[PDB]
Symmetry: D2
Subunit: 96 residues, 4 copies
């Protein structure tokens, strides 16, 4: 019923994220998604490279984020990872 | 010629940010905007409250961000602050 | 030969971290440990709760960190996690 | 009576921080120092360069941090900056 999975929408090299796609995860001082990280998986080396990290103060912002990936052609996929204090990490992989 | 100021676009309580509005600031390992922070200035108390912080690894992402402000009516303005390693902090205030 | 594992030293509720214990991991713009996160595993609920995150700009700081855990008795263990851009995540668990 | 100023202790290039020096600032979900950032002021260029940022989840950790400054001789001073949600930013400069 409650959704943690970081939806990814890709426009060129721009990536918009929300948790989750249809229902927005709670945003309170005691229940929150604190970070949304975006990783690129590299072609040259199969590295899981963190591109950046949206940190959100509990109950001050809802779990959205956006990134703009440098040199997108360098990656074979994107991995978004959302962290909820109560419910742990939830990831979503997009194949490029 | 080069722009650091974090453009803010507001859609309801959603805030899209890019540095800068017309020209995108460089994104390299030696020249980067490392963080984009969003603050709300509170009505009740005149506090400058950090809502969250988009951290970006040098040269891996371009300086964009988005936030979704909880309880937007609680604030009288939004303050975006971009940090460039070479050129320091650049802010932009939006009156609500 | 090269060490990524976050050494933990515990003094009361104070936690000192370095990667690694004997050899300090490189700190350059192209090879770095970017974050050191500390998690507490809760007794009440078996939750893996992120206590905080030391972010370090590539080549500007070496991979050390410290935390001071609130209400330490509430946890059954601490989990430190270091992220290296080239070599991924490395964790270390301490049973309390 | 309540202290926000980030005490700095320097051992070689190692920097230990606590807010404040004698009294530890509160650490609760509604009152917290959320970040402790360390800046180096460069000789070559007078730049205020962020070395890193200790982020702490409200009420999960007390406001301490440590850094280890790469190439310390390159700076003329260190600037620590603590952010409290209720009381704003508090800085402390150390001349090298
Ligand atoms: Fe949750
Ligand atoms: Fe710049
Ligand atoms: Fe490494
Ligand atoms: Fe305070």
């Amino acid at each position: 019923k409650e959704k943690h999975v970081p939806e990814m929408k890709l426009s060129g090299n721009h990536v918009d994220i929300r948790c989750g796609a249809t229902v927005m995860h709670p945003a309170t001082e005691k229940h929150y998604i604190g970070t949304i990280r975006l990783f690129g998986i590299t072609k040259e080396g199969n590295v899981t490279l963190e591109l950046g990290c949206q940190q959100i103060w509990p109950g001050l912002g809802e779990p959205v984020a956006s990134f703009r990936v440098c040199d997108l052609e360098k990656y074979k996929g994107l991995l978004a990872v959302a962290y909820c204090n109560l419910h742990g990490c939830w990831e979503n992989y997009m194949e490029l």
